[PDB]
């Protein structure tokens, strides 16, 4: 009843959770493993492309 006569903003703060983790986890769960290993090839070939 005395909510107006308090300062409870510290008792209720916005969480520091990154929602991106929930997104990337759903991304890996849907993909297979050989595509995960392929991404290491896509990155490596991109490095050699920038090198040449």
């Amino acid at each position: 009843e005395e909510c107006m006569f308090k300062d409870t903003r510290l008792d209720v703060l916005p969480p520091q959770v990154n929602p991106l983790n929930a997104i990337l986890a759903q991304h890996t769960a849907q993909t297979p493993v050989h595509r995960s290993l392929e991404k290491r090839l896509w990155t490596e070939v991109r490095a050699t492309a920038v090198s040449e």
Binding site: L37, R40, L41, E44, V45
Partner: peptide, 10 residues
Amino acid sequence: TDVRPQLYAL
């Protein structure tokens, strides 16, 4: 750095 054997492994 090789690419062909990595593709074979994949």
